[PDB]
Design an enzyme around this catalytic site. Structure first.
Site, PDB file in Angstrom:
ATOM      1  N   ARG A 133      -9.258  11.820   3.958  1.00 18.55           N
ATOM      2  CA  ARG A 133      -9.409  10.479   3.644  1.00 18.55           C
ATOM      3  C   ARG A 133     -10.414   9.960   4.544  1.00 18.55           C
ATOM      4  O   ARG A 133     -10.758  10.573   5.648  1.00 18.55           O
ATOM      5  CB  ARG A 133      -7.946   9.787   3.618  1.00 18.55           C
ATOM      6  CG  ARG A 133      -8.013   8.385   2.705  1.00 18.55           C
ATOM      7  CD  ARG A 133      -6.466   7.818   2.885  1.00 18.55           C
ATOM      8  NE  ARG A 133      -6.357   7.208   4.093  1.00 18.55           N
ATOM      9  CZ  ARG A 133      -5.346   6.749   4.686  1.00 18.55           C
ATOM     10  NH1 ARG A 133      -4.082   6.870   4.137  1.00 18.55           N
ATOM     11  NH2 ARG A 133      -5.130   6.173   6.022  1.00 18.55           N
ATOM     12  N   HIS A 168     -18.228  -3.142  -0.913  1.00 18.37           N
ATOM     13  CA  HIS A 168     -18.421  -4.583  -0.713  1.00 18.37           C
ATOM     14  C   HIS A 168     -19.773  -5.120  -0.908  1.00 18.37           C
ATOM     15  O   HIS A 168     -20.564  -4.022  -0.789  1.00 18.37           O
ATOM     16  CB  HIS A 168     -17.532  -5.390   0.451  1.00 18.37           C
ATOM     17  CG  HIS A 168     -18.087  -4.737   1.558  1.00 18.37           C
ATOM     18  ND1 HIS A 168     -19.098  -5.340   2.444  1.00 18.37           N
ATOM     19  CD2 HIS A 168     -17.492  -3.652   2.314  1.00 18.37           C
ATOM     20  CE1 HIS A 168     -19.237  -4.700   3.613  1.00 18.37           C
ATOM     21  NE2 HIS A 168     -18.536  -3.681   3.481  1.00 18.37           N
ATOM     22  N   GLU A 225      -1.533  -7.901   9.121  1.00 18.51           N
ATOM     23  CA  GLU A 225      -1.128  -6.680   9.445  1.00 18.51           C
ATOM     24  C   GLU A 225      -2.374  -5.956   9.812  1.00 18.51           C
ATOM     25  O   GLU A 225      -3.441  -6.239   9.353  1.00 18.51           O
ATOM     26  CB  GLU A 225      -0.697  -5.920   7.932  1.00 18.51           C
ATOM     27  CG  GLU A 225       0.629  -6.452   7.545  1.00 18.51           C
ATOM     28  CD  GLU A 225       1.180  -5.804   6.276  1.00 18.51           C
ATOM     29  OE1 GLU A 225       0.620  -5.073   5.897  1.00 18.51           O
ATOM     30  OE2 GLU A 225       2.132  -6.336   5.846  1.00 18.51           O
ATOM     31  N   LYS A 270      -5.487  -6.599   1.528  1.00 18.19           N
ATOM     32  CA  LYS A 270      -5.217  -6.369   2.702  1.00 18.19           C
ATOM     33  C   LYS A 270      -4.173  -7.543   3.231  1.00 18.19           C
ATOM     34  O   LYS A 270      -4.875  -8.596   2.999  1.00 18.19           O
ATOM     35  CB  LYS A 270      -6.463  -6.160   3.627  1.00 18.19           C
ATOM     36  CG  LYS A 270      -6.154  -6.193   4.998  1.00 18.19           C
ATOM     37  CD  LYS A 270      -5.250  -4.948   5.534  1.00 18.19           C
ATOM     38  CE  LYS A 270      -4.783  -5.204   6.896  1.00 18.19           C
ATOM     39  NZ  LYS A 270      -4.414  -3.797   7.524  1.00 18.19           N
ATOM     40  N   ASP A 328      -5.460  -3.917  11.408  1.00 16.38           N
ATOM     41  CA  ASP A 328      -6.378  -2.677  10.784  1.00 16.38           C
ATOM     42  C   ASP A 328      -6.462  -1.332  11.783  1.00 16.38           C
ATOM     43  O   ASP A 328      -6.816  -0.403  11.514  1.00 16.38           O
ATOM     44  CB  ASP A 328      -7.975  -3.450  10.917  1.00 16.38           C
ATOM     45  CG  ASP A 328      -7.982  -4.511   9.919  1.00 16.38           C
ATOM     46  OD1 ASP A 328      -7.447  -4.255   8.830  1.00 16.38           O
ATOM     47  OD2 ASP A 328      -8.571  -5.680  10.127  1.00 16.38           O
ATOM     48  N   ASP A 378      -0.021   4.064   1.132  1.00 15.37           N
ATOM     49  CA  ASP A 378      -0.794   4.723   2.196  1.00 15.37           C
ATOM     50  C   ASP A 378      -0.674   6.082   2.838  1.00 15.37           C
ATOM     51  O   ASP A 378      -1.314   6.596   3.559  1.00 15.37           O
ATOM     52  CB  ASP A 378      -1.485   3.756   3.204  1.00 15.37           C
ATOM     53  CG  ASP A 378      -0.335   3.128   4.248  1.00 15.37           C
ATOM     54  OD1 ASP A 378       0.715   3.148   3.599  1.00 15.37           O
ATOM     55  OD2 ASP A 378      -0.908   3.104   5.255  1.00 15.37           O
ATOM     56  N   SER A 438      -9.256   8.413  10.997  1.00 21.26           N
ATOM     57  CA  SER A 438      -8.623   8.136   9.701  1.00 21.26           C
ATOM     58  C   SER A 438      -7.078   8.429  10.006  1.00 21.26           C
ATOM     59  O   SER A 438      -6.645   9.322  10.522  1.00 21.26           O
ATOM     60  CB  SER A 438      -9.000   9.120   8.682  1.00 21.26           C
ATOM     61  OG  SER A 438      -8.219   8.986   7.424  1.00 21.26           O
ATOM     62  N   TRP A 457     -21.993  -2.957   1.600  1.00 25.02           N
ATOM     63  CA  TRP A 457     -22.017  -1.594   1.507  1.00 25.02           C
ATOM     64  C   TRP A 457     -22.704  -1.222   0.226  1.00 25.02           C
ATOM     65  O   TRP A 457     -23.866  -0.874   0.472  1.00 25.02           O
ATOM     66  CB  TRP A 457     -20.412  -0.928   1.246  1.00 25.02           C
ATOM     67  CG  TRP A 457     -20.460   0.647   1.501  1.00 25.02           C
ATOM     68  CD1 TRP A 457     -21.332   1.299   1.306  1.00 25.02           C
ATOM     69  CD2 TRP A 457     -19.309   1.231   1.766  1.00 25.02           C
ATOM     70  NE1 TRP A 457     -20.940   2.715   1.513  1.00 25.02           N
ATOM     71  CE2 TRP A 457     -19.484   2.780   1.910  1.00 25.02           C
ATOM     72  CE3 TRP A 457     -17.879   0.957   1.867  1.00 25.02           C
ATOM     73  CZ2 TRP A 457     -18.376   3.771   1.826  1.00 25.02           C
ATOM     74  CZ3 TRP A 457     -16.596   1.589   1.785  1.00 25.02           C
ATOM     75  CH2 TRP A 457     -17.090   3.133   1.871  1.00 25.02           C
ATOM     76  N   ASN A 491     -11.922  -6.391   3.682  1.00 25.86           N
ATOM     77  CA  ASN A 491     -13.310  -6.822   4.575  1.00 25.86           C
ATOM     78  C   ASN A 491     -13.165  -8.346   4.323  1.00 25.86           C
ATOM     79  O   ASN A 491     -12.210  -8.944   4.074  1.00 25.86           O
ATOM     80  CB  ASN A 491     -14.513  -6.387   3.703  1.00 25.86           C
ATOM     81  CG  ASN A 491     -14.893  -4.987   4.449  1.00 25.86           C
ATOM     82  OD1 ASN A 491     -15.449  -5.447   5.505  1.00 25.86           O
ATOM     83  ND2 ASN A 491     -14.167  -3.851   4.392  1.00 25.86           N
ATOM     84  N   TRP A 547       0.989  -1.247  -0.155  1.00 22.84           N
ATOM     85  CA  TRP A 547      -0.283   0.036   0.049  1.00 22.84           C
ATOM     86  C   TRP A 547       0.901   1.223  -0.128  1.00 22.84           C
ATOM     87  O   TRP A 547       1.650   1.310   0.928  1.00 22.84           O
ATOM     88  CB  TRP A 547      -0.751  -0.169   1.334  1.00 22.84           C
ATOM     89  CG  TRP A 547      -1.957  -1.044   1.233  1.00 22.84           C
ATOM     90  CD1 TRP A 547      -1.924  -2.470   1.060  1.00 22.84           C
ATOM     91  CD2 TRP A 547      -3.369  -0.969   1.320  1.00 22.84           C
ATOM     92  NE1 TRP A 547      -3.089  -3.193   1.250  1.00 22.84           N
ATOM     93  CE2 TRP A 547      -3.892  -2.327   1.057  1.00 22.84           C
ATOM     94  CE3 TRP A 547      -4.058   0.174   1.706  1.00 22.84           C
ATOM     95  CZ2 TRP A 547      -5.322  -2.303   1.688  1.00 22.84           C
ATOM     96  CZ3 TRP A 547      -5.541  -0.140   1.760  1.00 22.84           C
ATOM     97  CH2 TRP A 547      -6.138  -1.258   1.639  1.00 22.84           C
ATOM     98  N   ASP A 602     -12.290   2.797   0.036  1.00 18.25           N
ATOM     99  CA  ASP A 602     -13.267   3.725   1.115  1.00 18.25           C
ATOM    100  C   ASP A 602     -13.223   5.110   0.538  1.00 18.25           C
ATOM    101  O   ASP A 602     -12.857   6.112   1.392  1.00 18.25           O
ATOM    102  CB  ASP A 602     -12.557   3.692   2.538  1.00 18.25           C
ATOM    103  CG  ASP A 602     -13.328   4.072   3.496  1.00 18.25           C
ATOM    104  OD1 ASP A 602     -14.695   4.365   3.492  1.00 18.25           O
ATOM    105  OD2 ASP A 602     -12.839   4.648   4.664  1.00 18.25           O
TER     106      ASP A 602
END
Ligand SMILES: *[C@@H]1O[C@H](CO)[C@@H](O)[C@H](O)[C@H]1NC(C)=O
Ligand SMILES: OC[C@H]1O[C@H](O)[C@@H](O)[C@@H](O)[C@@H]1O
Ligand SMILES: *[C@H]1O[C@H](CO)[C@@H](O)[C@H](O)[C@@H]1O
Ligand SMILES: [Mg+2]
Length: 360
Positions: free
Chosen positions: A89, A181, A313, A309, A315, A49, A96, A184, A220, A47, A136
């Site tokens: 974000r 997903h 690691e 994901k 969340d 990120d 976040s 959602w 997810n 990622w 997201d």
């Protein structure tokens, strides 16, 4: 034109090292150890990120893949990378870890980040690169516009996604936009609005050649396909990713976007999961490693099953006093205690390994 076909997926050295140095030493079961060694080689996404990953992780991964390919890998290896740094974000989240804000130069910061990534991808045009664009993000525009930060971020998310789709539209790249997903956007009332949103973005970006379609279930735990609906999905009729995608694709395609999908199954092995509610996304208990990444999905609409994901690691921290604490990480079905987001969570890795399906 499936970007996963004809290549091997690179299993990176960071995840390999986490399993070998952090996990294996603590595993007593010989069977669990042998399975941990195998999981170390399963190719998962890496990622971007944080801005600092662009001139570090990204360059290092592409350099390592080039070296392996030049040494004779056959088939050649391809990179799997997530672009995840929009300003403001995770607009609807309780917490976040994004570093930039729209009110503090976030647009210019993000454009420069995309531009530097583009420069690096151009310099590694010999490495097929698959990207997941901003998990997201736009899914929030379908259902979370009641949240003021989301309605305030919407135009910027749209504009910056279009910017990213065009700047990263390079001959050796394939992009998949995040599309939430089944729990959602898969609810029947959210399908068409989602299809309208993603197809219009696609059109507005000029239908870039590199835009291959959408990614679902990122980070997810949903099943790809199970015969019975997990209790926490009720009463959604589209209770797994296959149901979601089979309903979603036709609507997208009718609106000019024949999106191919990639589906995260890194933590989808055990169904039902230990989730008490479907929206409980943090370090969920009763989960296991799922189907291994592959381009042979048996489904015309799905280019691949992937591990986006990296299971093991974290969340998010479960320490309620920590600055980055998200209350979802302190719920009854979240494994605790948990370290900071992105850090190795050995207890969670072991859970995933014990619940793997198919087994390792
Ligand atoms: C992002 O990192 C780049 C180098 O990759 C650096 O030049 C730039 O200043 C960073 N952006 C911000 C807003 O700090
Ligand atoms: O593949 C070898 C590898 O297998 C697994 C574990 O036993 C590791 O400790 C070892 O390095
Ligand atoms: C390896 O051995 C220890 C001690 O019996 C256990 O804690 C573990 O579950 C595994 O069997
Ligand atoms: Mg069918």
């Amino acid at each position: 034109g499936n970007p996963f076909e004809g290549v091997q997926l690179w299993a990176n050295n960071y995840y390999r090292s986490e399993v070998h140095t952090l996990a294996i030493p603590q595993i007593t079961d010989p069977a669990l150890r042998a399975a941990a060694s195998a999981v170390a080689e399963v190719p998962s996404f890496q990622w971007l990120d944080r801005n600092v990953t662009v001139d570090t992780l990204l360059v290092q991964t592409l350099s390592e893949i080039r070296e392996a390919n030049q040494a004779g890998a056959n088939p050649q290896y391809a990179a799997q990378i997530v672009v995840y740094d929009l300003p403001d974000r995770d607009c609807a989240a309780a917490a976040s870890n994004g570093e930039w804000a729209i009110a503090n130069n976030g647009v210019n910061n993000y454009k420069a980040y995309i531009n530097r990534i583009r420069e690096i991808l151009i310099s590694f045009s010999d490495v097929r690169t698959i990207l997941v664009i901003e998990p997201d993000s736009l899914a929030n525009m379908v259902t979370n516009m009641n949240v003021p930060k989301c309605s305030g971020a919407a135009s910027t998310y749209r504009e910056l996604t279009i910017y990213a789709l065009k700047q990263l539209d390079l001959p050796h790249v394939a992009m998949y936009m995040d599309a939430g997903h089944a729990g959602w956007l898969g609810w029947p009332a959210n399908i068409q609005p989602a299809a309208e949103l993603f197809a219009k973005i696609y059109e507005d970006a000029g239908k870039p050649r590199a835009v291959r379609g959408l990614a679902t279930n990122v980070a997810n735990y949903n099943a790809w396909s199970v015969s019975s609906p997990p209790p926490y999905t009720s009463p959604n009729p589209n209770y797994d990713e296959k149901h979601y995608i089979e309903a979603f694709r036709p609507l997208l395609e009718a609106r000019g976007f024949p999106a191919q999908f990639i589906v995260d199954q890194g933590r989808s092995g055990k169904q039902p999961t230990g989730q008490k509610e479907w929206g409980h996304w943090c370090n969920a208990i009763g989960t296991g490693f799922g189907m291994r990444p592959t381009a042979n999905t048996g489904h015309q609409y799905v280019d691949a099953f992937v591990w986006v994901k990296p299971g093991g690691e974290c969340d998010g921290t479960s320490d309620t006093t920590a600055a980055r604490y998200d209350y979802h990480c302190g719920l009854e079905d979240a494994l605790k205690p948990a370290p900071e987001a992105g850090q190795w969570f050995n207890e969670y890795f072991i859970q995933l390994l014990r619940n793997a399906n198919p087994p390792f």
